[model samples]
Target chain A: EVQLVQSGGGLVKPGGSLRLSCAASGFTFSSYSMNWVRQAPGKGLEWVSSISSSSSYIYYADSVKGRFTISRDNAKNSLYLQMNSLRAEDTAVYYCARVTDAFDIWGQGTMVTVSSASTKGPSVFPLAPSGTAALGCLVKDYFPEPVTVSWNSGALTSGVHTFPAVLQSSGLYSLSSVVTVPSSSLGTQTYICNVNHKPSNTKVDKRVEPKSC
Target chain B: DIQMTQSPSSVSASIGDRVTITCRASQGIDNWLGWYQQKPGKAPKLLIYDASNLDTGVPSRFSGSGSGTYFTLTISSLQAEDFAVYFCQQAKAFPPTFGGGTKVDIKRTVAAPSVFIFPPSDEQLKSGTASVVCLLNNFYPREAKVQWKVDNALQSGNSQESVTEQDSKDSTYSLSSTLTLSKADYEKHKVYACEVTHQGLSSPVTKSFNRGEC
Candidate 1:
């Protein structure tokens, strides 16, 4: 049950500074090291920085050698990453992982957008049809295409279909997801579509009521 | 960014056999190296880091050595669960790069999966949608890809859900992919196909479901 919950990410202008936090639970944070890994949109992973337990040794990749600072608060049981002189190329999903030989535990990821443009969050619309076993959740008009959509507070493993996000002409993105449930209980159950837009730190919950259909 | 190349891209070993894999970097990266083991359909697990240090809770049989540009990952005694793909990554430079994977496979004859397609049940079709299932049984190594096509054209969208399960009686794997589509599309399409690609097969295996059959 080791969990690394990170702070929400948001849009930061170029040349501005951003500080990200990762709170460690279920284990002694000061007893083990923590590492920060990032991946640009549709790119491979890059190790940014790492801090040893008790704030002893710290390692940084050549890319972020001077721009990134990794630190921790033992009493708070949390790790932090402060980045300075942000550039557009610095936009990526930052993850905090606990190092025990390898990064065995990782946070859900905080997406940082280093841009000067305005940020927008997604608007969720429930598209549940009448008398149908499938329910659709349409998420539209969002900046930063990497939004997460979940069903009933849980990710759908089976009987779920999530379409890729399509960039609209306005530069915002739109995506949709459909989940299958028993037709007999569709009218009796309440389905909720949870949309998480990390870049704007926005969350929307669209409930599919039985009467709506 | 340092480029990584792994040698002996694949190895066939038996249980209790000693297996070794090597990763060479384009340039020196000191001890900022990590080794990962990835099983089919699962995220990679780090086994060794900093060139030679074992990760906490990892078995002692796994060891790593070497530095500068060359590194080695050795398993003192291979276990059944150790049959997986291993990768090497360097954290020294920008854009940390990963080496080509080295697959540690079991030393045995490969087994190709038997593909089967099941049409949507009447109860499912009555709901105005159809869920067609393509089951791949008795596949070895557990690495396979499933794709759905309608009228010979590949279908795009996230309407397909796949699950892989291991048979307890044997080590073989079984995979199932369910394609959900509107009944109108399912009935109007001439044919639906399930294509599976596996290492054991010389070519991709395909099974077709004709609309007439429904």
Candidate 2:
């Protein structure tokens, strides 16, 4: 019957810093480690950070590594989280959960809104032409902050051409790649595009049709 | 990081049947495995954690085990309440990975309910006290509720519910309940009804009879 009561709501500006706390009761606080989770509106749950209550060891998820710090206080049986250089995109509900055999216990959560603009990803267009033609895949209107565009060609028997991700203004990125294939590659080869964006778990996959090839 | 893969993806079984689901890790996890159950439109629940150790308050019928990269979750006996999608996760690695999932399905195809109504002995019927039994059988996937009524009104008394043995040959479910009644209701020729509601049935199944009909 362990319980975790977390702080209430907060609002912070982009690039500002904020601190949150969670109080633990009913269990030996030192024996358990606390994990921080966040859920952005309209998004899935995301792992943030974890802190060892006794040893003070901290592990951060890659996405939040440099921006977040986790610590605990034995005297108060409490855990604290401090995030710096926040963004409007960081607006979300943060929770502190105890990780043992599982995350069985959790705090009520604190809603924090980072007052800033949100970014969107690009839409994709795929093109594959007939016999000995180049296969084209186009994507546009994505933030440039940090995006990765990758491709997969299942046609090993034919010649291949792959391209690096393209960049646009304001940290936006676009993806366009062309591959030349033998006529037989049509209907037999599979082309796929994968877009992965940082700052969030936003990933998109588009499969190109071979009918044109 | 260790990865996991579960076989059979999905399975069909009967209530009271026993099932063993396997999960294989890409590398040795040293028993750092957890099993979770997820139902449609619901969050996944941690069923067995640290491999083999059941979560608090979980039923005794649910068990898990295995060493290194091999693991298994064995249901000593399946219950209609146990039907759902189960997944296996490995915690040995920094970023944990999970097996796709295994869905436990009902064995029966059309999903029609089989019903039985049992009356008390002639001597008991003659006495002022009587007992009526309602046996609901061959249902699929478990989510069924039972109710007893007399002359369209709810009946309340010493009642006990039990799930009988399900034949492994076919994946079906069987449940029964006994309701205590007084001789006055029988003497009045009131209708004794056993109504069952299940997700698989488009309409509730109600079996009824009166003292005269009996």
Candidate 3:
């Protein structure tokens, strides 16, 4: 059951323009090959292109080469991504995978925001993707709004927590938090969230995992 | 194996607006396939490949179709200058696979077709037979088609192409195609694919070869 259904989340500005989709079920969508990975909140994870499982070869990730494009429609199993002249860091949170064994399988993301963008950090998930539940950590739109949330889980794991950082209207600052562990803590462990935007001293940190049942 | 899926996931339209995007592949990939266009920070251009053709200067309102698994990419009007973000790929097989992109603002929507590729030249890699050269300049309606593949099969009646010229300054057209093997057939086929096609290229523009690419 190779399912990768994705489609949602977008709010453009900066230069405006968007298009995202990924729908594949079962297998054989012309063989395989469908990649598109992006993450720009706390940042880390950016391949941004793929399309060849018989579509005949294509790749890009020299910093999004010519901008970004990876098309596919082998009869509707679907797979598409379109981007055009938009900035504000290009906002992020995109996923659509199926890369042999590594990228494994993903497709439940699409939280792009660009109303002048800049909230760089915080978009964790796991409110219950499987088993034990509770692990959410959102932290959108950062700015000068007296901030300093906390949570840690370095040594194996511990009782970390957070909540309280709201204040948006573009002025920036949106928050969320949740904790609770051990359902086999997914890929072992790693769940940090330390922000200290104390009027520009800016010391942000973010990480997430634990939701593999 | 082949599995692609693309839909509305993201599309808002404007300018002349008249967009259509769809991709599904779970089986037959008859016309091979290809299509790309990206522009946020950069790289992602190759407007259509074999699936329907249309890449060398791309513009005819942009178009594409379906085959076995079914496909489609039409943009009849829309062109405030063309938006960005669009992808779909599948070289028929091999590590080629992509499809997970679709974004439109102004809206959105490749090559010398420019495909120089000439190595194994001078020193000819210690002789024994080398000769490579898969030119293919500007490219356009000039009716194009070039082929040759060793590690990827299809070596057919050998290789040799040319006779499409035209481009005085941009009538758009050019072709070269050449392939001389042996070095024990490049050491038992290390890989030397070249495949090129065009009604204007919606697909068929392969390239593979290396002796360090020299």
Candidate 4:
């Protein structure tokens, strides 16, 4: 396997919290530990959160509650973190990091800005949804920065889709909306993730599926 | 391996908004382009054909163009079911590589909007109330979503809440989602699990009940 060194650097507002990434390779990541860490400027790294299928444990430390979180994928052996709230004082460099024996791999810290929308389009795909189908979507963390995932095609005859509103951490967003497509409606549909960040409004990354099963 | 870089890590569009994702390869992989949709329980769904062609019955609004290193996936409008992670896969070779996913999720800057609950518990409607709860402890600046599954079938219409009161120990955070359903749904199903959604997070999660219960 190969390691995913990250790109982009330092992005944060004084009070805005940001989430960066650290992807790794060299193993399939089954039965491995995915960890989240906090690195000090000149000091050492601190343990944040971690999860392992084999270990069957999810550990969240103190002082960072409601502000930070860590997640992992057993199959891929990757990890994630989510930060909340924004304070100009919260601005700093962020990274998607990796670890095994130690936090050896790292990425250039992605600086976050609490300014406004960065024109970064959210990611989304359209599945072959039936009129009565409802799908789920989430940004893992750092949302409302401005993004949307949805069905681009016209409404079908019947069937409506739905999602739980109010996205709890680690829960299906329901934040976006519940879609209602006609069950009898037929034909491929385009589901899209639209963005209005700067530099560009939307960059296409999407999926297509039939209206019916 | 041709490296893939996608723009728009996030986005917001109105109904019928035309959205697109630009996928560039480190090197040309010919016409071996494909797209996939990934939500909570369900696996990835394949869309697009030969890079720009529609996936058979796909709608006209959902289309892709550009060849070689440059490619795109577009949607005519935005719908709720359409929210989730959008990824581009290059079957150009073995192992296949995916672009860092872009996603659309419910965005409620407000503390705790509202939580809705649905039924069926598990897909088979087995036994107990398979209620799954999601918790994100503190990995500030980033968030992760966990989906619930009963009897291997993905249940729809769940609720989520955010608690920012908890602070982070290190810098990262932890979160969880609880799925509760009728005990019957539990007894009838073999597994109850939560799938976490994060670009950096991998594989999927399952709490199997083949032997016991959650």
Candidate 5:
């Protein structure tokens, strides 16, 4: 029954500040300490800081020692993370956890974007080949990394494979999906790739015409 | 590379029996190991964290121990609901890895499937293409592997559709797999076989179809 519900995420500009909250319930919140962990887009988890239940003992990782503040409101049973002087590198999904020797209960993460008007939509292209039974859809240069790809045909569910988004050096992400069809169906069926960029609320479709093998 | 290997892949025990599962990491992970339990069609629940500390609301009968590269999860007295899969995960390094689950099963008779394969009908063959259906019924555990072979050779590029449904009354499963192929190839091939592998059987169960069976 223990739960930690987190505040909704937001878009913040560089040099600006943001505050994230984790409201504890179903237990005595002040009896256990809380910790903060963050993972950059497509990166691994990093322990950021921890605050004791009594708000007396606090520890911060070396990377966020100066700009990150951990505080609490014992009356409301809520914990807060106040981040300042944010940079583009600070964009990540932040998680709050309750410690029982180690993190035993966690909150569904809240995303934080530290960018200055650099959002972009994806450009989708088809990778169709003649005499082949498989087709690929390439989606590139999308920001915020919350994009989805699906095929026009629902019957291809078993044969569709979508790879995870890869972070590019230019602060954008790229992903691809492939679908396999029976060789006999080639030259008679058409395939389409549908892409949805969630952040920008845009959709793109790329179509491919079948060729005989 | 850090890896987690679990022991005894499966165990059989009765109610109130003590059960222990072990996990070994390829390298040292200090006290970052966590134990989780999963039931069918439910999300995994954390039981132990930091190698030996029980999580909030976890039953007192569940305990964990060991550190560094080895750990153990012990259930002092197993309950009916505790007969499920358990896994161990390490959080000490990047790209965390989980152990292959250990299944705790009740000590009782197991149910095996009765398999049957149906050949294409005359109406299906009239289209110059046909589908062969392999049906399995009255199975337990609900996990099985199915393969299609034509004339003793493995078939590829043919689309196979599989559907499985569980009978809530008896807690048994019924599943079917359908393979599509050209009617010309089906007529030329000497035999078509459906091979099924399940944990309840000592060997794979195979059902074959001849050309004139239809």
Candidate 6:
């Protein structure tokens, strides 16, 4: 009564990571659970964590915390994965694995190539989250790529921005970006951290700003 | 401990379609990154670490974002993005939980929210058990309480039960219950369940060992 299929391959930098997904069919997803599996470029697979449909909760493995998540959708029956920071060693095949020890249901493996890079996202510090300073998003990648961070609140701020990569984890492909906007306009507007993926004709809004409280 | 919410809740996709899920934390979990996916009857797999770093074997198309309190999970080129539920969880604390799952569909949702679990495939196959035992030894802010029952009747006053009244780390008392019942006792008696009283749950029970399949 349940099934999972994955989105296929992608090309990334030696210091860039690729995020993929698993879509489910045949049942009410809220009641069920989804698990993501990692298959290295040459390595096999290992446990990641369990994500629930109803609670937006995550249970991580002893080793794989911090790098992954399974997100539900704007549409029913669809699930998504958001992988951050890319590295050359991050290159590998990944799959959407059904959870609860049900390792049988697997999406066709997706191949992600992490091309090496040197540029990275800017380093952003957590400023007092109470002021009217612009929301400056950071892209911390060792080989940080270029991205545009704009305030949906056209009234937020008018400034140019750049993101660099952060060097951390196994593959050393850490990338972060910073886009700043006034804390006031964000009080009633939306904002996003957009990733303009050049290699793969795609534009990704990796981060979304919070709507004013 | 911020609560996160994902929208629409589900979607359907073709072999090459795309899917996405957005997670909004109650408060900013900061850069405390994490992500997971769970299929039925199986343990979850970790995909992201520190919010954006892909686990060693993760796919390229799988992406994650950590900004303030809002995060996003995306799957590009649904060719392999078939059917499955996606989950999100934070690593900011212990006793971790997950996101209300998101589903991707390539087929009809024949049945509603339902689960069919088979009896343990084999009694010999021991499943992992989690416990927050030894509260007194840890000096936790929580109190330690333990109770046990064999069969349908409560097995009180059993010397096999032990409680330590001091904390090993914090101020709250902690205790652990380790019961190894004989085969005959376990089968004849329904089972023994021990619970730790905590602020979270009125009665928080640790792992339970069921009877063997004869």
Best by TM-score: 5
Overall lDDT per candidate, in order of appearance: 0.75, 0.67, 0.61, 0.46, 0.74, 0.47
TM-score of chain B of each: 0.72, 0.51, 0.34, 0.50, 0.76, 0.47
* lDDT for each residue of candidate 6 in B1-214, tens digit (9 for 90 to 100): 4455665465656566667778776766776656666543343556665677787577887888767777887778775433556767654554344566665545322211110101111121232211111111222322235555445465454312223222212212223233333344444553445444544344454433344422
lDDT of 4: 0.46
Worst lDDT run of 10 residues, candidate 3 chain A, spans A121-130
**Cα lDDT tens digits for candidate 4, B1-214:** 5567666765544455677777788888788777655564333444675777665445676787887899888887767667656777665643345677665544322132112222222322332234433433233323445566666577666544433312212323233344544565445666555555553434443323332422
List, residue by residue over A114-145, the lDDT tens digit for candidate 3: 66544454322222223443343444456534
DockQ of each: 0.10, 0.03, 0.01, 0.02, 0.06, 0.01
Clashing pairs in 5: none
lDDT of 2 by residue, A100-129 (tens): 866666687787766543466665555434
Residue pairs with clashing backbones, model 2: A129-A212, A129-A213, A143-A171, A143-A172, A144-A171, A144-A172
- For candidate 4, the iRMS in Å is 19.7
Candidate 1, residues B1-214: lDDT per residue as tens digits? 6899998876778899999999999999999999988665444567888988887688999999999999999999999999888889887864567887788876655678767665554444676766666666666866688888888888767343333334444555555565667788788887889998999889999987676552
Q: Write the per-residue lDDT of candidate 1 for residues A143-188, one digit (tens) a residue.
A: 8758988887894545555655544434456666656566787756
lDDT of 1 at A19: 95
lDDT (Cα, tens digit) per residue for candidate 4, span A1-213: 345444332544334555555566665555455554443221122345656646476666454666776665555555566666654333334444343332333444444434333333333323223224333232222233334433443332122222223322321222232333444543444444332223335444334343321
Top lDDT hit: 1
lDDT, candidate 6, residue A36? Answer: 65
lDDT of candidate 2 over B1-214, digit per residue (tens): 5668887665777789998898999989897888877654344567888988888878999998888989999988898789878888777876556687777876766465566555544445565756565666556655567888878987664554555333355565556565665687567756878898876778888976676542
Candidate 3: residue A30 Cα off by (Å): 36
Candidates ranked by TM-score, best first?
5, 1, 2, 4, 6, 3
Q: Rank the candidates by lDDT, best first.
A: 1, 5, 2, 3, 6, 4
| Native-to-model Cα distance after best TM-score fit, residue A159 in candidate 1, in Å | 22
Candidate 3 lDDT over B122-148, as tens digits, reads: 344465656565655555544467777
Worst 10 residues of 3 chain B by lDDT: B105-114
How close to the true structure is residue B161 of candidate 4, measured as C-alpha lDDT?
42
Model 5: per-residue lDDT, tens digit, A11-51? 88779899999999998998988878776753345668889
